[PDB]
From a paper:
Angiotensin-1-converting enzyme (ACE, EC 3.4.15.1) is a zinc peptidase and a key enzyme in cardio-vascular physiology. ACE is a central component of the Renin-Angiotensin-Aldosterone System (RAAS), wherein it converts angiotensin I into the vasoactive peptide hormone angiotensin II (AngII). Interestingly, ACE consists of two catalytically active domains (referred to as the N- and C-domains based on location on the polypeptide chain) that, while very similar in sequence and structural topology, display differences in substrate processing abilities. N-acetyl-Ser-Asp-Lys-Pro (Ac-SDKP) is specifically cleared by ACE10.
Co-crystallisation experiments were carried out to assess the interaction between the N-domain and tetrapeptide Ac-SDKP. Surprisingly, two crystal forms were obtained. One form presented the same cell dimensions as the previously described minimally glycosylated N-domain30 with 2 chains per asymmetric unit in P1. The structure at 1.8 Å showed electron difference density within the catalytic channel, which was interpreted as the Ac-SD product, resulting from the enzymatic reaction. On the other hand, the N-acetyl-serine (AcS), of the Ac-Ser-Asp fragment, presents a different orientation. Its Hydroxyl side chain makes direct electrostatic contacts with His331, His491 and Tyr501, as well as a water-mediated interaction with Zn2+. The AcS amino group interacts with a single water molecule itself connected to Thr358 (main chain) and Asp393. The acetyl moiety may be stabilised in the small hydrophobic area composed of Ala332 and Thr358.
Author numbering: 1 to 129, 133 to 610
């Protein structure tokens, strides 16, 4: 480690700690910068040489983290918890958690190489037919979204899961052991316990379970209604009205979001078409229009525009030179208070427009907290960070707002039109809930050792069936590693944040709508141009992780806890409607034929 980046000496007290944090701050930015830059260079241009550079950068970060971590632990270990400055406690607490920096050098290099190889496998995996091969984004994504051929969807689903999952498995095992070894030296029973500690809630798991209990009936009814719509198209052979839905038929590789099957499920097709994808295509929208439209929502609230550095640096389309990139949309803070970027292989669709807002919400958080200490540049919790862009996207999605931006010619205000809208939103928001909940249940079980490698797939499918009521459309065994075919698993990005975000965003929505002085139905609120709503949201953003999330939430929404009531309020009309419809159709709620799998198509997989 560079002499300039090394910690000096400070007194064994709070006044020393302060100078410690400020000295940390000065060097941490450069170290964070070089790490993020190397990661950027790799993720926008996947090469062996860029991987080597990124690992080298990661080693430097671990060296830095070890030095300042051991210094923090040398001077402040039995005393930091009693510090009077709560922000300083949070800075110190972060600095003294070494993570992977606890590993000896050889194991550090192993760990860094595993992360690099897992990332490369996921993002360069292909499905091949001919010499021609399909990438996940955009090829397989488009098939899952718009093909209605059972056999073709199966080819894409199986192809992807086989291609990404199978080679990831041995690496993922090794990563798990090393991660646990690292965090066990920070005092956590396993990595999952460390991840859960970010919510600073001794009752976190029970609180999530209580939330899910309230949400589950909404999902069960949506599921039964959707299954019926699928049965009408795919027939009795491929859809079991009392069994799980085959996992490839829901519009999405992970069946995580069901908005792409909206045309099959739309209750009243004679009302205005609420999926504006075809209109965006008709009008010739490109990625840059999408990002500018997103930005203009943020400025309408008197939040920050995207700086020149964002526009100059970002990767907003998949590169045309055909170079390998990480296509999964992400938002980047370079920690120099200047560079902030999105990397998205943007496609011209309504869901992608929502995704643009999601990523821009991350950027806005970065812009607002850029002048806090580096350790405090994160959300009040990770679910807050995930919720910002989605909150705005809720307003953007409204038929009224779409009309304002020229994406919906007709405007209607009737019960049918409300049901269509709320159903479309349920496909996006309700359908996701089980998946957002289950991923880290799976991962926590793996970190804790409850799920050994011998049960990775058995336990993944247990949870997928239990929560989502889906089944794999082909037979799977333990050679398959279907959890690894989801981005966040090989890229080691925690998932419970998305479940938290999906509850939280409705709490935020309700509060900002109230602040905007909006008086109507919650699901028709558009906060666009509300400078009052903007100021309320800005208070959250500028706080970063400087204050307990429970207190930041209290200030914003009047409650110090996650609460399903705003989501329930928002969906109330369609919750009642689906329940009525299912009863009148004589549906079974759930999937009591839990063992059921669909047969293979006759000529699978030739032609
Ligand atoms: C779409 O339509 C709904 C429903 O509108 C109501 O019912 C219709 C069948 C007609 O009879 C309408 O004349 C009638 O307003 C609209 O929701 C409604 O918005 C109004 C005005 O913002 C709300 O009234 C307010 O109520 C609060 C107290 O809650 C008072 O403080 C205010 O002074 C104000 O009078 C009303 O609560 C609300 N109705 C329901 C059932 O939620 C909606 O605004 C409209 N949307 C669009 C996009 O046009
Ligand atoms: C993708 O990454 C490679 C490195 O792996 C880049 O190629 C290098 O570019 C530097 C600086 O422009 C040159 O000095 C080197 O000669 C190149 N090195 C190697 C090993 O080829 C490449 O430019 C990157 N591509 C894009 C489009 O950014
Ligand atoms: C696509 C994207 O980057 N956004 C994600 C986070 O990775 C997100 O908001 N949530 C879920 C579901 C989704 O609709 O994107 C995800 O795993 O992608
Ligand atoms: C799992 O399934 C594949 C193909 O369906 C098969 O080739 C393989 O033998 C099975 N793996 C094991 C370990 O039995
Ligand atoms: Cl998280
Ligand atoms: Zn995100």
């Amino acid at each position: 480690l560079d002499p300039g980046l090394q910690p000096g000496q400070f007194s064994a007290d709070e006044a020393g700690a302060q100078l410690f944090a400020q000295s940390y701050q000065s060097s941490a930015e450069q170290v964070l910068f070089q790490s993020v830059a190397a990661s950027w260079a790799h993720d926008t241009n996947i090469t062996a040489e860029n991987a080597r550079r990124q690992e080298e950068a990661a080693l430097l970060s671990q060296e830095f983290a070890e030095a300042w971590g051991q210094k923090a632990k040398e001077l402040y270990e039995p005393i930091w918890q009693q510090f009077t400055d709560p922000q300083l406690r949070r800075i110190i607490g972060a600095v003294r958690t070494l993570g992977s920096a606890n590993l000896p050098l050889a194991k550090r290099q192993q760990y860094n190489a595993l992360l690099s190889q897992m990332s490369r496998i996921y993002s360069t995996a292909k499905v091949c037919l001919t010499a021609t091969c399909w990438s996940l984004d955009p090829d397989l994504t488009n098939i899952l979204a718009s093909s209605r051929s059972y056999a073709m969807l199966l080819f894409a689903w199986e192809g992807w899961h086989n291609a990404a999952g199978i080679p990831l498995k041995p690496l993922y095992e090794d990563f798990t052991a090393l991660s646990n070894e690292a965090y066990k030296q920070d005092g956590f029973t396993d990595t999952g316990a460390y991840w859960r500690s970010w919510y600073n809630s001794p009752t976190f798991e029970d609180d999530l379970e209580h939330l899910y209990q309230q949400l589950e009936p909404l999902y069960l009814n949506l599921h039964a209604f959707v299954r019926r719509a699928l049965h009408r198209r795919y027939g009795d052979r491929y859809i079991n009205l009392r069994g799980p839905i085959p996992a490839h038929l829901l519009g999405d590789m992970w069946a995580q979001s069901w908005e792409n099957i909206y045309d099959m499920v739309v209750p009243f097709p004679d009302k205005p078409n609420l999926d504006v994808t075809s209109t965006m295509l008709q009008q010739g929208w490109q990625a840059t229009h999408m990002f500018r439209v997103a930005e203009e929502f943020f400025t309408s609230l008197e939040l920050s525009p995207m700086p020149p550095e964002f526009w100059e640096g970002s990767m907003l389309e998949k590169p045309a030179d055909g170079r390998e990139v990480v296509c999964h949309a992400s938002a980047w803070d370079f920690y120099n208070r200047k560079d902030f970027r999105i990397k998205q292989c943007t496609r011209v669709t309504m869901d992608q427009l929502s995704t643009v807002h999601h990523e821009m919400g991350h950027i806005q958080y970065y812009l607002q907290y850029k002048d806090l200490p580096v350790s405090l540049r994160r959300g009040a919790n990770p679910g807050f960070h995930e919720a910002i862009g989605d909150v705005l996207a809720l307003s953007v999605s409204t038929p009224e707002h779409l009309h304002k931006i020229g994406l919906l010619d007709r405007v209607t205000n009737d019960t049918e039109s409300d049901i269509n809208y709320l159903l479309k939103m349920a496909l996006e928001k309700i359908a996701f809930l089980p998946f957002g909940y289950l991923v880290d249940q799976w991962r926590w079980g793996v970190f804790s050792g409850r799920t050994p490698p011998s049960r990775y797939n058995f336990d993944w499918w247990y949870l997928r069936t239990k929560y989502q009521g889906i089944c794999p459309p082909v037979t799977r065994n333990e050679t398959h590693f279907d959890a690894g075919a989801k981005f966040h698993v090989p890229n080691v990005t925690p998932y419970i944040r998305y479940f938290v975000s999906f509850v939280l965003q409705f709490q935020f929505h309700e509060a900002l709508c109230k602040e905007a002085g909006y008086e109507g139905p919650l699901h028709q609120c558009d906060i666009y141009r509300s400078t009052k709503a903007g100021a309320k949201l800005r208070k959250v953003l500028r706080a970063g992780s400087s204050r307990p999330w429970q207190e930041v939430l209290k200030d914003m929404v009047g409650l110090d806890a996650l609460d399903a009531q705003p989501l329930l309020k928002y969906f109330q009309l369609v919750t009642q409607w689906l329940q009525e419809q299912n009863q009148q159709n004589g549906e079974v709620l759930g999937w009591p034929e839990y063992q059921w799998h669909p047969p293979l198509p006759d000529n699978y997989p030739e032609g």
